[PDB]
Structure formats: structure tokens, C-alpha cells
């Protein structure tokens with residue numbers, strides 16, 4: 098692995114790693130309370146034998162620049178972070194894969210960037226969502242204070258998340274957890290669109306997902322393919338991420 102830095106539109110430095118390979122160029126986008134270490138820890142990275150893998154830390158996470166404001170965590174800024182990585186590696190074709198909100202980011206990048214040949218969204222769909230202001234603010238308060246890491250650790254432990262997902266939360270600055278949560282009130286609720294006709298769009302979720310309807314909506318509206326894994330909930334589906342990586346490898350091959 099080599100490390101890289103690029104700058105987003107708003108000047109935020111975005112840091113990541115590049116794992117060279119002779120195959121397709123894949124860009125990996127982590128979830129909110131995560132960083133780029135999850136790709137190796139989940140076994141997803143090992144499941145892609147040939148790809149040139151680019152894994153970024155989104156703003157405010159990992160080794161990327163701090164933000165600390167709700168507006169600085171607007172979805173459009175994350176999209177800019179990812180597009181800056183596409184610029185650095187200069188390819189005409191990329192395949193994006195994102196987990197949870199990272200999947201939503203990947204879908205939005207696909208909508209706006211014609212260099213995205215494929216986008217895979219794990220446990221996030223493409224449809225418009227309702228984002229209640231009170232629930233957002235309550236969650237932001239719960240994650241940003243002294244007890245915020247413990248709150249998330251307990252939440253994910255009680256819901257059966259894999260250990261790497263439980264542990265990643267404590268690596269995120271609490272102020273960035275709060276600001277990222279509040280960032281949802283700046284555009285995150287709009288549906289995503291297909292970027293161009295030849296793009297391959299894939300949604301993945303738990304077969305037991307309590308809200309599969311919007312995943313089927315994306316099949317109809319975007320021509321996305323839906324992949325299911327054996328799990329009762331989206332959080333538990335994260336235990337299957339390496340297995341999903343093997344199926345991604347089959348597409349890239």
C-alpha cells in the first residue's frame with residue numbers, strides 16, 4: 098500500500114491508501130462512524146484479489162481534514178471528496194463500493210460523475226428519505242458528548258454488529274460524529290439518479306431487512322440489481338461484508 102492525499106473542492110485534505118493491482122480500479126467509501134481500516138478488518142479487501150483499490154477517509158474521519166460544522170458534512174461535500182480521489186488516479190473508469198451512508202455517497206457520485214462505471218451500495222438504497230429534524234438532533238447530541246462512543250458501542254453491540262464495526266466508532270472525533278449527523282439536514286434526503294445508461298448499479302441488503310420496499314424501488318427506477326445476504330437486519334448484514342466482496346470480485350472479473 099501507498100498513501101495519498103488529495104484536496105476536495107472546499108480545500109479539505111482527503112487522505113487514503115492505494116493498493117496497486119492489475120485489475121479494475123475500485124474506490125471504497127466507509128460509513129459514518131467508520132474509517133478506511135474497515136476494508137481490511139472486514140475481509141472485504143482480501144476478497145478483491147486483483148483490483149487496484151483506493152480507500153479514502155472521508156472528511157473528519159481517519160487521517161482526513163477536520164470539519165466540525167454541520168454544513169461542512171453536507172452530502173455534496175462527501176461527493177466532492179470522492180471525486181477528488183477519482184481525479185488523483187486519473188482513470189476513465191472506476192467502480193465504487195460504499196457501506197451504509199457510504200453507499201448513498203457512492204450512488205450520488207455515480208449520478209454526477211461519468212467516470213463511474215459501477216456503483217455498489219451496501220445497506221443503503223437510492224430513494225428519497227424522510228429525515229426528521231428532531232431525531233437528527235437527538236442523535237447528534239447522543240453521539241457528540243462524553244458518552245457518545247459508549248452510546249454507539251452499546252447500540253452496535255446490542256444489535257450484533259461485527260467487532261470491527263463496534264470498535265471503529267471510538268476512532269472518530271465526537272465532534273465530527275455530531276457534525277456529520279447534523280450534516281444530514283443539508284440535502285442527504287434526496288433520491289439519487291442514474292448517471293448514464295451503461296452504468297452498473299447494485300444495491301445490497303439483508304434478506305430480513307424490515308424496509309426492503311425502497312430497494313425494490315431502486316430496481317424499478319434506476320435499473321439497479323438487488324443482492325441479498327442472509328441476515329435479519331442491516332447491522333447484522335455487515336457480518337457478511339467479506340462474502341459480498343467475493344461477489345463484487347465476480348463482477349470485476
Ligand SMILES: CC(C)[C@@H]1NC(=O)[C@@H]2CCCN2C(=O)C/N=C(\N[C@H](C(=O)N[C@@H](Cc2ccccc2)C(=O)N[C@H](CC(=O)O)C2=N[C@H](C(=O)O)CS2)C(C)C)[C@H](C(C)C)NC1=O
Pocket residue numbers: 127128129130131196197198199201220221222223226227228232233236240252274277278281331332
Ligand atoms: C441508529 C443510529 C446508531 C445510526 N447512526 C449511525 O450509525 C451514525 C452515527 C452518527 C450518525 N450516523 C448515521 O448513520 C446517520 N444516522 C441515521 N441515518 C439514517 C438511516 O436510516 N441510515 C440507514 C442507511 C441509509 C442511508 C441513506 C439512505 C438509505 C439508507 C441505515 O441503515 N443505518 C444503519 C442503522 C440501522 O440499520 O438501524 C447504520 N448506518 C451507519 C452508517 O451509515 O455508517 C452504520 S449502521 C438516514 C437518515 C440516512 C439515523 C437517524 C438518526 C437519522 N441513525 C443511524 O442510522
